[PDB]
Design a protein around this motif. Structure first.
Motif, PDB file in Angstrom:
ATOM      1  N   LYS A   1      60.080  -4.902  49.111  1.00 21.69           N
ATOM      2  CA  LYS A   1      58.703  -4.582  48.679  1.00 21.69           C
ATOM      3  C   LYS A   1      58.006  -5.820  48.158  1.00 21.69           C
ATOM      4  O   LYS A   1      58.538  -6.535  47.295  1.00 21.69           O
TER       5      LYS A   1
ATOM      6  N   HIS B   1      50.788   3.509  50.886  1.00 24.07           N
ATOM      7  CA  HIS B   1      49.660   4.276  50.342  1.00 24.07           C
ATOM      8  C   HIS B   1      48.282   3.923  50.877  1.00 24.07           C
ATOM      9  O   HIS B   1      47.391   3.435  50.145  1.00 24.07           O
TER      10      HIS B   1
ATOM     11  N   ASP C   1      54.405   8.168  45.702  1.00 24.08           N
ATOM     12  CA  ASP C   1      54.085   7.133  44.702  1.00 24.08           C
ATOM     13  C   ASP C   1      54.126   7.693  43.269  1.00 24.08           C
ATOM     14  O   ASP C   1      53.305   7.303  42.413  1.00 24.08           O
TER      15      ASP C   1
ATOM     16  N   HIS D   1      52.127  -3.457  49.246  1.00 23.23           N
ATOM     17  CA  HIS D   1      50.977  -2.893  48.542  1.00 23.23           C
ATOM     18  C   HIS D   1      49.788  -3.806  48.810  1.00 23.23           C
ATOM     19  O   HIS D   1      49.808  -4.966  48.380  1.00 23.23           O
TER      20      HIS D   1
ATOM     21  N   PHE E   1      54.250  -6.916  46.411  1.00 22.53           N
ATOM     22  CA  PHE E   1      52.937  -6.523  45.869  1.00 22.53           C
ATOM     23  C   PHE E   1      51.943  -7.629  46.201  1.00 22.53           C
ATOM     24  O   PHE E   1      52.010  -8.729  45.626  1.00 22.53           O
TER      25      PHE E   1
ATOM     26  N   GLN F   1      58.673   6.226  48.154  1.00 21.85           N
ATOM     27  CA  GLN F   1      58.001   5.431  47.120  1.00 21.85           C
ATOM     28  C   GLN F   1      57.886   6.167  45.801  1.00 21.85           C
ATOM     29  O   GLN F   1      56.995   7.009  45.649  1.00 21.85           O
TER      30      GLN F   1
ATOM     31  N   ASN G   1      46.231   3.166  41.828  1.00 19.90           N
ATOM     32  CA  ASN G   1      45.981   2.034  42.737  1.00 19.90           C
ATOM     33  C   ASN G   1      46.817   2.271  44.008  1.00 19.90           C
ATOM     34  O   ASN G   1      48.013   2.550  43.903  1.00 19.90           O
TER      35      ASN G   1
HETATM   36 ZN   LIG Z   1      51.535   0.249  45.080  1.00 22.03          ZN
END
Ligand SMILES: [Zn+2]
Ligand SMILES: C[As](C)(=O)[O-]
Ligand SMILES: C[As](C)(=O)[O-]
Ligand SMILES: [Cl-]
Ligand SMILES: [Zn+2]
Length: 451
Positions: free
Chosen positions: A152, A242, A316, A184, A154, A66, A289
Protein backbone atom coordinates in the motif's frame (compact mmCIF):
# COMPACT_ATOMS: atom_id res chain seq x y z
CA UNK A 1 -11.54 -25.90 15.53
CA UNK A 2 -14.68 -27.50 14.09
CA UNK A 3 -14.55 -31.33 13.68
CA UNK A 4 -18.23 -31.96 13.09
CA UNK A 5 -20.23 -32.42 9.92
CA UNK A 6 -22.63 -29.50 9.98
CA UNK A 7 -25.49 -29.25 7.51
CA UNK A 8 -26.80 -25.85 6.54
CA UNK A 9 -30.11 -27.17 5.41
CA UNK A 10 -32.38 -25.72 2.66
CA UNK A 11 -30.96 -22.24 2.35
CA UNK A 12 -31.27 -19.96 -0.68
CA UNK A 13 -27.70 -20.10 -1.95
CA UNK A 14 -26.01 -17.40 -4.03
CA UNK A 15 -22.72 -18.42 -5.64
CA UNK A 16 -20.96 -17.72 -8.94
CA UNK A 17 -23.76 -15.78 -10.62
CA UNK A 18 -26.53 -18.23 -9.62
CA UNK A 19 -29.13 -18.15 -6.87
CA UNK A 20 -30.78 -21.48 -6.03
CA UNK A 21 -32.35 -23.43 -3.14
CA UNK A 22 -29.77 -25.74 -1.66
CA UNK A 23 -27.93 -27.13 1.32
CA UNK A 24 -24.26 -26.95 2.22
CA UNK A 25 -22.40 -29.59 4.15
CA UNK A 26 -19.45 -28.43 6.27
CA UNK A 27 -16.89 -31.05 7.25
CA UNK A 28 -14.50 -29.67 9.87
CA UNK A 29 -12.95 -26.45 8.49
CA UNK A 30 -14.05 -27.09 4.88
CA UNK A 31 -17.05 -27.11 2.58
CA UNK A 32 -17.49 -30.72 1.61
CA UNK A 33 -20.70 -30.67 -0.45
CA UNK A 34 -23.30 -28.41 -2.04
CA UNK A 35 -26.63 -30.20 -2.48
CA UNK A 36 -29.01 -28.46 -4.86
CA UNK A 37 -32.72 -28.33 -4.10
CA UNK A 38 -34.85 -28.83 -1.00
CA UNK A 39 -33.91 -31.83 1.14
CA UNK A 40 -37.08 -33.75 2.07
CA UNK A 41 -38.36 -33.53 5.66
CA UNK A 42 -36.60 -36.59 7.11
CA UNK A 43 -33.28 -36.19 5.31
CA UNK A 44 -30.21 -34.70 7.04
CA UNK A 45 -27.48 -36.53 5.07
CA UNK A 46 -26.16 -38.02 8.35
CA UNK A 47 -24.96 -34.62 9.62
CA UNK A 48 -23.66 -34.40 13.21
CA UNK A 49 -25.45 -31.09 13.51
CA UNK A 50 -28.14 -29.36 11.47
CA UNK A 51 -28.93 -25.68 11.12
CA UNK A 52 -32.33 -25.14 9.52
CA UNK A 53 -31.86 -22.40 6.92
CA UNK A 54 -35.29 -22.23 5.26
CA UNK A 55 -35.97 -18.54 4.59
CA UNK A 56 -32.28 -17.58 4.91
CA UNK A 57 -29.85 -16.59 2.19
CA UNK A 58 -26.43 -18.27 2.20
CA UNK A 59 -23.34 -16.49 0.76
CA UNK A 60 -19.56 -16.98 0.98
CA UNK A 61 -18.31 -14.64 3.75
CA UNK A 62 -17.25 -11.16 2.57
CA UNK A 63 -13.54 -10.62 2.03
CA UNK A 64 -12.72 -6.99 2.80
CA UNK A 65 -9.56 -5.64 1.09
CA UNK A 66 -9.33 -2.47 3.18
CA UNK A 67 -9.74 -2.02 6.94
CA UNK A 68 -7.87 -0.05 9.57
CA UNK A 69 -8.08 -1.93 12.85
CA UNK A 70 -5.80 0.61 14.64
CA UNK A 71 -3.37 -1.90 16.17
CA UNK A 72 -0.60 -1.46 17.07
CA UNK A 73 -0.52 1.97 18.61
CA UNK A 74 -3.93 3.56 18.07
CA UNK A 75 -5.89 1.13 20.29
CA UNK A 76 -8.01 3.73 22.05
CA UNK A 77 -9.90 3.79 18.72
CA UNK A 78 -10.12 0.03 18.06
CA UNK A 79 -8.22 -3.27 18.13
CA UNK A 80 -7.88 -6.26 15.82
CA UNK A 81 -9.98 -8.19 18.42
CA UNK A 82 -12.73 -5.56 18.72
CA UNK A 83 -13.13 -4.85 15.01
CA UNK A 84 -12.82 -8.42 13.75
CA UNK A 85 -15.72 -9.25 16.13
CA UNK A 86 -17.66 -6.39 14.51
CA UNK A 87 -16.65 -7.82 11.12
CA UNK A 88 -18.01 -11.33 11.77
CA UNK A 89 -21.27 -9.79 13.05
CA UNK A 90 -21.50 -8.12 9.60
CA UNK A 91 -20.80 -11.35 7.65
CA UNK A 92 -17.16 -10.38 6.87
CA UNK A 93 -14.98 -13.46 7.40
CA UNK A 94 -11.63 -12.20 6.02
CA UNK A 95 -10.03 -8.73 6.20
CA UNK A 96 -6.89 -6.99 4.93
CA UNK A 97 -5.63 -4.37 7.40
CA UNK A 98 -3.67 -1.31 6.25
CA UNK A 99 -0.12 -0.31 7.28
CA UNK A 100 -0.92 3.16 8.80
CA UNK A 101 -0.62 1.91 12.37
CA UNK A 102 1.89 3.10 15.05
CA UNK A 103 4.44 1.81 14.21
CA UNK A 104 3.52 1.51 10.54
CA UNK A 105 3.87 -1.85 8.82
CA UNK A 106 6.87 -0.83 6.69
CA UNK A 107 9.33 -3.54 7.66
CA UNK A 108 9.17 -7.28 7.77
CA UNK A 109 9.39 -7.46 11.58
CA UNK A 110 6.19 -5.37 11.81
CA UNK A 111 4.28 -7.56 9.41
CA UNK A 112 5.26 -10.74 11.32
CA UNK A 113 4.14 -8.97 14.51
CA UNK A 114 0.68 -8.16 13.09
CA UNK A 115 0.36 -11.77 11.90
CA UNK A 116 1.00 -12.90 15.50
CA UNK A 117 -1.66 -10.45 16.79
CA UNK A 118 -4.05 -11.92 14.23
CA UNK A 119 -3.28 -15.48 15.30
CA UNK A 120 -3.71 -14.60 19.00
CA UNK A 121 -6.75 -12.27 18.83
CA UNK A 122 -8.61 -12.03 15.45
CA UNK A 123 -12.12 -13.40 15.03
CA UNK A 124 -11.81 -13.42 11.23
CA UNK A 125 -9.12 -14.57 8.78
CA UNK A 126 -6.45 -11.95 8.43
CA UNK A 127 -4.00 -10.30 6.08
CA UNK A 128 -1.86 -7.16 6.21
CA UNK A 129 -0.73 -4.87 3.38
CA UNK A 130 2.94 -3.97 3.50
CA UNK A 131 3.54 -0.18 3.54
CA UNK A 132 5.83 1.69 1.16
CA UNK A 133 7.65 4.87 2.23
CA UNK A 134 10.10 7.25 0.60
CA UNK A 135 12.88 5.24 2.29
CA UNK A 136 12.12 1.49 2.52
CA UNK A 137 12.63 0.08 -0.95
CA UNK A 138 15.03 -2.58 0.39
CA UNK A 139 12.29 -3.81 2.77
CA UNK A 140 9.78 -4.00 -0.07
CA UNK A 141 12.10 -6.23 -2.18
CA UNK A 142 12.43 -8.68 0.78
CA UNK A 143 8.64 -9.04 1.27
CA UNK A 144 7.56 -12.71 0.82
CA UNK A 145 4.65 -12.18 -1.64
CA UNK A 146 2.80 -15.22 -0.30
CA UNK A 147 2.53 -13.42 3.07
CA UNK A 148 0.93 -10.09 2.02
CA UNK A 149 -1.89 -9.10 -0.39
CA UNK A 150 0.40 -6.41 -1.82
CA UNK A 151 2.03 -3.05 -1.07
CA UNK A 152 0.00 0.00 0.00
CA UNK A 153 1.17 3.49 -0.97
CA UNK A 154 -0.49 6.68 0.27
CA UNK A 155 -0.11 9.15 -2.62
CA UNK A 156 -2.23 11.60 -0.58
CA UNK A 157 -4.10 12.01 2.75
CA UNK A 158 -1.08 10.81 4.79
CA UNK A 159 1.63 13.20 6.04
CA UNK A 160 5.42 13.04 6.20
CA UNK A 161 6.79 9.52 6.48
CA UNK A 162 3.73 7.68 5.14
CA UNK A 163 3.11 10.12 2.26
CA UNK A 164 4.94 8.81 -0.78
CA UNK A 165 5.63 11.96 -2.77
CA UNK A 166 9.25 11.33 -3.84
CA UNK A 167 8.99 10.97 -7.63
CA UNK A 168 12.22 9.00 -7.97
CA UNK A 169 10.89 6.73 -5.21
CA UNK A 170 7.54 6.14 -7.02
CA UNK A 171 9.30 5.42 -10.32
CA UNK A 172 11.61 3.05 -8.43
CA UNK A 173 8.81 1.19 -6.69
CA UNK A 174 6.68 0.83 -9.82
CA UNK A 175 9.66 -0.15 -11.95
CA UNK A 176 11.49 -2.46 -9.51
CA UNK A 177 9.03 -4.03 -7.06
CA UNK A 178 7.16 -7.11 -8.19
CA UNK A 179 3.94 -7.02 -6.26
CA UNK A 180 0.47 -5.69 -6.47
CA UNK A 181 0.54 -1.97 -5.56
CA UNK A 182 -2.60 -0.58 -3.94
CA UNK A 183 -2.85 3.22 -3.92
CA UNK A 184 -4.73 5.97 -2.13
CA UNK A 185 -5.00 8.66 -4.84
CA UNK A 186 -5.50 12.35 -3.86
CA UNK A 187 -3.22 15.09 -5.20
CA UNK A 188 -2.12 17.14 -2.18
CA UNK A 189 -0.96 20.12 -4.31
CA UNK A 190 -4.52 20.56 -5.58
CA UNK A 191 -6.07 20.11 -2.12
CA UNK A 192 -3.75 22.86 -0.80
CA UNK A 193 -4.70 25.23 -3.63
CA UNK A 194 -8.40 24.66 -2.81
CA UNK A 195 -7.82 25.04 0.98
CA UNK A 196 -6.18 28.40 0.28
CA UNK A 197 -9.11 29.59 -1.88
CA UNK A 198 -11.79 28.54 0.61
CA UNK A 199 -9.99 29.75 3.76
CA UNK A 200 -9.25 33.13 2.14
CA UNK A 201 -12.81 33.60 0.83
CA UNK A 202 -14.88 32.03 3.67
CA UNK A 203 -12.57 31.98 6.76
CA UNK A 204 -11.16 29.38 9.19
CA UNK A 205 -14.31 27.70 10.49
CA UNK A 206 -15.17 25.75 7.33
CA UNK A 207 -17.81 23.11 8.00
CA UNK A 208 -18.33 19.69 6.42
CA UNK A 209 -19.82 21.09 3.19
CA UNK A 210 -16.36 22.39 2.17
CA UNK A 211 -14.84 18.91 2.47
CA UNK A 212 -15.60 17.65 -1.08
CA UNK A 213 -14.76 21.12 -2.46
CA UNK A 214 -11.30 21.02 -0.87
CA UNK A 215 -10.57 17.29 -1.41
CA UNK A 216 -12.01 17.78 -4.90
CA UNK A 217 -12.89 15.62 -7.86
CA UNK A 218 -9.84 17.00 -9.71
CA UNK A 219 -7.53 16.22 -6.75
CA UNK A 220 -8.68 12.54 -6.94
CA UNK A 221 -8.60 12.32 -10.73
CA UNK A 222 -5.20 13.98 -11.14
CA UNK A 223 -3.56 11.58 -8.66
CA UNK A 224 -5.24 8.48 -10.18
CA UNK A 225 -4.38 9.55 -13.75
CA UNK A 226 -0.71 9.96 -12.74
CA UNK A 227 -0.64 6.58 -11.01
CA UNK A 228 -2.23 4.89 -14.07
CA UNK A 229 0.33 6.48 -16.44
CA UNK A 230 3.21 5.35 -14.25
CA UNK A 231 1.77 1.81 -14.04
CA UNK A 232 1.30 1.72 -17.83
CA UNK A 233 4.92 2.93 -18.31
CA UNK A 234 6.26 0.07 -16.15
CA UNK A 235 3.58 -2.54 -16.91
CA UNK A 236 3.01 -2.56 -13.12
CA UNK A 237 0.13 -4.18 -11.26
CA UNK A 238 -1.83 -1.25 -9.78
CA UNK A 239 -5.03 -1.39 -7.69
CA UNK A 240 -6.62 2.01 -7.06
CA UNK A 241 -8.56 2.16 -3.78
CA UNK A 242 -11.87 3.77 -2.81
CA UNK A 243 -12.99 5.41 -6.02
CA UNK A 244 -15.25 8.38 -5.26
CA UNK A 245 -15.82 10.08 -8.62
CA UNK A 246 -17.49 9.51 -11.96
CA UNK A 247 -14.50 11.19 -13.62
CA UNK A 248 -12.02 8.54 -12.43
CA UNK A 249 -14.02 5.75 -14.08
CA UNK A 250 -12.66 6.76 -17.49
CA UNK A 251 -9.22 5.44 -16.31
CA UNK A 252 -10.52 1.85 -15.97
CA UNK A 253 -11.77 -0.74 -18.43
CA UNK A 254 -14.60 -3.20 -18.57
CA UNK A 255 -13.78 -4.84 -21.90
CA UNK A 256 -11.76 -7.64 -20.21
CA UNK A 257 -12.24 -9.69 -17.02
CA UNK A 258 -10.69 -8.62 -13.66
CA UNK A 259 -8.22 -11.53 -13.83
CA UNK A 260 -6.67 -10.06 -17.03
CA UNK A 261 -6.41 -6.44 -15.83
CA UNK A 262 -3.07 -4.95 -14.81
CA UNK A 263 -4.98 -1.96 -13.41
CA UNK A 264 -7.93 -2.63 -11.11
CA UNK A 265 -10.18 -0.61 -8.80
CA UNK A 266 -12.10 -0.88 -5.56
CA UNK A 267 -15.11 1.09 -4.27
CA UNK A 268 -16.25 1.28 -0.66
CA UNK A 269 -19.82 0.94 0.61
CA UNK A 270 -20.04 4.49 1.97
CA UNK A 271 -19.35 5.89 -1.53
CA UNK A 272 -22.13 3.60 -2.87
CA UNK A 273 -24.55 4.60 -0.11
CA UNK A 274 -24.05 8.25 0.85
CA UNK A 275 -23.90 11.46 -1.20
CA UNK A 276 -23.16 15.08 -0.29
CA UNK A 277 -26.93 15.57 0.20
CA UNK A 278 -26.35 13.63 3.47
CA UNK A 279 -23.86 16.14 4.94
CA UNK A 280 -26.68 18.32 6.33
CA UNK A 281 -28.02 15.45 8.46
CA UNK A 282 -24.88 13.44 9.38
CA UNK A 283 -22.14 16.08 9.37
CA UNK A 284 -18.68 14.77 10.34
CA UNK A 285 -20.09 11.25 10.83
CA UNK A 286 -19.70 10.88 7.03
CA UNK A 287 -16.37 12.72 6.76
CA UNK A 288 -14.03 10.41 4.81
CA UNK A 289 -11.01 10.65 2.52
CA UNK A 290 -11.63 10.61 -0.42
CA UNK A 291 -14.70 12.76 0.34
CA UNK A 292 -18.27 11.69 -0.29
CA UNK A 293 -19.16 13.71 -3.39
CA UNK A 294 -22.17 14.25 -5.72
CA UNK A 295 -25.32 12.18 -6.17
CA UNK A 296 -24.18 11.79 -9.81
CA UNK A 297 -20.88 10.31 -8.60
CA UNK A 298 -22.70 7.80 -6.40
CA UNK A 299 -24.89 6.95 -9.44
CA UNK A 300 -21.84 6.45 -11.68
CA UNK A 301 -20.07 4.24 -9.13
CA UNK A 302 -23.21 2.06 -8.76
CA UNK A 303 -23.34 1.74 -12.59
CA UNK A 304 -19.62 0.85 -12.68
CA UNK A 305 -20.17 -1.96 -10.16
CA UNK A 306 -22.84 -3.30 -12.50
CA UNK A 307 -20.77 -2.83 -15.67
CA UNK A 308 -17.40 -4.03 -14.32
CA UNK A 309 -15.30 -0.86 -14.37
CA UNK A 310 -15.17 -1.31 -10.58
CA UNK A 311 -13.66 -4.69 -9.70
CA UNK A 312 -14.51 -5.10 -6.00
CA UNK A 313 -16.38 -3.64 -3.06
CA UNK A 314 -14.85 -3.07 0.37
CA UNK A 315 -15.44 -0.87 3.43
CA UNK A 316 -12.38 1.16 4.44
CA UNK A 317 -13.59 0.54 8.04
CA UNK A 318 -11.61 3.18 9.96
CA UNK A 319 -12.80 3.89 13.53
CA UNK A 320 -12.08 7.06 15.47
CA UNK A 321 -13.62 8.05 18.81
CA UNK A 322 -16.33 10.71 18.61
CA UNK A 323 -14.02 13.28 20.32
CA UNK A 324 -11.76 12.93 17.25
CA UNK A 325 -14.71 13.47 14.86
CA UNK A 326 -15.51 16.92 16.33
CA UNK A 327 -14.96 20.33 14.64
CA UNK A 328 -14.44 21.89 11.17
CA UNK A 329 -13.61 19.95 7.97
CA UNK A 330 -10.05 21.09 8.88
CA UNK A 331 -9.97 19.69 12.45
CA UNK A 332 -12.24 16.61 12.38
CA UNK A 333 -10.82 13.16 11.61
CA UNK A 334 -11.80 11.45 8.35
CA UNK A 335 -12.98 7.88 8.65
CA UNK A 336 -15.58 5.84 10.49
CA UNK A 337 -16.65 2.27 11.23
CA UNK A 338 -18.71 0.32 8.64
CA UNK A 339 -17.96 -3.42 8.71
CA UNK A 340 -20.82 -4.52 10.99
CA UNK A 341 -23.43 -3.07 8.62
CA UNK A 342 -21.91 -2.76 5.12
CA UNK A 343 -23.35 -6.09 3.86
CA UNK A 344 -26.81 -5.11 5.21
CA UNK A 345 -26.47 -1.78 3.36
CA UNK A 346 -25.57 -3.51 0.09
CA UNK A 347 -28.50 -5.91 0.53
CA UNK A 348 -30.78 -2.92 1.12
CA UNK A 349 -29.65 -1.55 -2.29
CA UNK A 350 -30.47 -4.95 -3.83
CA UNK A 351 -34.07 -4.58 -2.48
CA UNK A 352 -34.13 -1.36 -4.51
CA UNK A 353 -32.88 -2.90 -7.75
CA UNK A 354 -29.59 -0.99 -7.59
CA UNK A 355 -27.59 -4.26 -7.57
CA UNK A 356 -28.38 -7.96 -7.89
CA UNK A 357 -27.60 -10.30 -5.01
CA UNK A 358 -25.37 -12.12 -7.49
CA UNK A 359 -23.27 -8.95 -8.14
CA UNK A 360 -22.92 -8.23 -4.42
CA UNK A 361 -21.57 -11.74 -3.76
CA UNK A 362 -19.22 -11.49 -6.75
CA UNK A 363 -17.92 -8.06 -5.70
CA UNK A 364 -17.53 -8.80 -1.96
CA UNK A 365 -16.31 -12.41 -2.08
CA UNK A 366 -15.52 -13.98 -5.48
CA UNK A 367 -13.52 -11.15 -7.06
CA UNK A 368 -11.55 -10.10 -3.98
CA UNK A 369 -10.40 -13.76 -3.74
CA UNK A 370 -9.52 -13.81 -7.48
CA UNK A 371 -7.87 -10.39 -7.56
CA UNK A 372 -5.59 -11.04 -4.53
CA UNK A 373 -5.15 -14.74 -5.40
CA UNK A 374 -6.42 -15.91 -1.99
CA UNK A 375 -6.25 -19.68 -1.54
CA UNK A 376 -9.47 -21.61 -0.85
CA UNK A 377 -11.74 -18.73 0.17
CA UNK A 378 -14.39 -16.50 -1.44
CA UNK A 379 -16.48 -19.22 -3.10
CA UNK A 380 -18.93 -21.90 -2.04
CA UNK A 381 -16.95 -24.78 -3.61
CA UNK A 382 -16.04 -28.22 -2.28
CA UNK A 383 -12.58 -28.14 -0.66
CA UNK A 384 -12.72 -24.44 0.17
CA UNK A 385 -12.76 -23.08 3.75
CA UNK A 386 -16.21 -22.88 5.30
CA UNK A 387 -16.28 -19.07 5.60
CA UNK A 388 -20.01 -18.49 5.23
CA UNK A 389 -22.76 -16.03 6.11
CA UNK A 390 -26.49 -16.68 6.47
CA UNK A 391 -28.68 -13.56 6.19
CA UNK A 392 -32.38 -13.22 7.04
CA UNK A 393 -34.17 -11.01 4.45
CA UNK A 394 -37.32 -10.70 6.59
CA UNK A 395 -35.87 -9.78 9.98
CA UNK A 396 -35.10 -6.03 10.15
CA UNK A 397 -32.10 -4.75 12.07
CA UNK A 398 -32.02 -1.27 13.65
CA UNK A 399 -28.57 0.14 14.40
CA UNK A 400 -28.31 1.51 17.95
CA UNK A 401 -25.77 2.35 20.69
CA UNK A 402 -26.73 -0.90 22.35
CA UNK A 403 -25.96 -3.19 19.41
CA UNK A 404 -22.91 -1.40 17.87
CA UNK A 405 -19.82 -3.65 18.30
CA UNK A 406 -16.96 -1.39 17.09
CA UNK A 407 -14.89 -0.13 19.99
CA UNK A 408 -15.56 3.49 18.95
CA UNK A 409 -19.21 2.98 19.83
CA UNK A 410 -20.94 4.89 16.98
CA UNK A 411 -22.03 4.18 13.41
CA UNK A 412 -22.79 6.39 10.38
CA UNK A 413 -25.89 4.14 10.10
CA UNK A 414 -27.09 4.88 13.65
CA UNK A 415 -30.92 4.93 13.72
CA UNK A 416 -31.29 3.24 10.31
CA UNK A 417 -33.39 0.06 10.00
CA UNK A 418 -32.08 -2.48 7.45
CA UNK A 419 -34.55 -5.00 6.04
CA UNK A 420 -31.93 -7.77 6.44
CA UNK A 421 -30.03 -9.11 9.43
CA UNK A 422 -27.08 -11.46 9.79
CA UNK A 423 -28.42 -14.75 11.16
CA UNK A 424 -25.18 -16.80 11.34
CA UNK A 425 -21.47 -16.38 10.46
CA UNK A 426 -19.06 -19.30 10.11
CA UNK A 427 -15.29 -18.81 9.98
CA UNK A 428 -13.40 -21.99 8.96
CA UNK A 429 -16.52 -24.03 9.87
CA UNK A 430 -16.70 -22.50 13.37
CA UNK A 431 -19.89 -20.71 14.24
CA UNK A 432 -18.64 -17.20 15.22
CA UNK A 433 -21.91 -15.31 15.46
CA UNK A 434 -25.54 -16.39 15.76
CA UNK A 435 -28.76 -14.48 16.32
CA UNK A 436 -27.27 -11.20 17.48
CA UNK A 437 -24.52 -12.65 19.67
CA UNK A 438 -20.84 -13.43 19.24
CA UNK A 439 -19.86 -17.05 19.99
CA UNK A 440 -18.55 -18.02 23.45
CA UNK A 441 -15.32 -19.21 21.84
CA UNK A 442 -13.22 -17.45 19.22
CA UNK A 443 -13.36 -19.33 15.91
CA UNK A 444 -10.30 -20.92 14.38
CA UNK A 445 -8.66 -18.24 12.20
CA UNK A 446 -5.86 -18.40 9.59
CA UNK A 447 -3.66 -15.93 7.76
CA UNK A 448 -4.98 -15.43 4.26
CA UNK A 449 -2.58 -17.18 1.85
CA UNK A 450 -1.75 -15.35 -1.36
CA UNK A 451 -0.76 -17.19 -4.57
ZN1 LIG B 1 -7.20 5.69 1.87
C1 LIG C 1 -40.69 -29.77 5.42
AS1 LIG C 1 -39.05 -29.62 6.49
C2 LIG C 1 -39.21 -30.67 8.14
O1 LIG C 1 -37.71 -30.21 5.55
O2 LIG C 1 -38.78 -27.95 6.89
C1 LIG D 1 -6.59 6.07 6.00
AS1 LIG D 1 -5.96 7.43 4.75
C2 LIG D 1 -4.31 8.20 5.48
O1 LIG D 1 -5.69 6.60 3.25
O2 LIG D 1 -7.20 8.65 4.57
CL1 LIG E 1 -21.08 0.73 11.22
ZN1 LIG F 1 -8.13 3.09 3.79
Amino acid sequence: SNAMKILLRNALITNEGKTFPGSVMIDGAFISRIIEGELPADDNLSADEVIECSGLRLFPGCIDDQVHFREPGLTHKATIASESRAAVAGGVTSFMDMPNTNPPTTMWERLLEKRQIGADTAWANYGFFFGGTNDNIDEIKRVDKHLVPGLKLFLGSSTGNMLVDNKETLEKIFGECDLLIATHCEKEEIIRANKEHYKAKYGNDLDIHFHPLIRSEEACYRSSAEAVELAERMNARLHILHLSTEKELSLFRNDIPTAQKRITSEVCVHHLWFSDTDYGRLGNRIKWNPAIKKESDREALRAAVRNGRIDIIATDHAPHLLREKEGSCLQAASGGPLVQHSLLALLELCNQGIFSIEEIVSKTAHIPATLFAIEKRGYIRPGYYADLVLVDPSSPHTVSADNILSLCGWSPFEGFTFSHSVAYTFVNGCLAYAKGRLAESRPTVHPLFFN
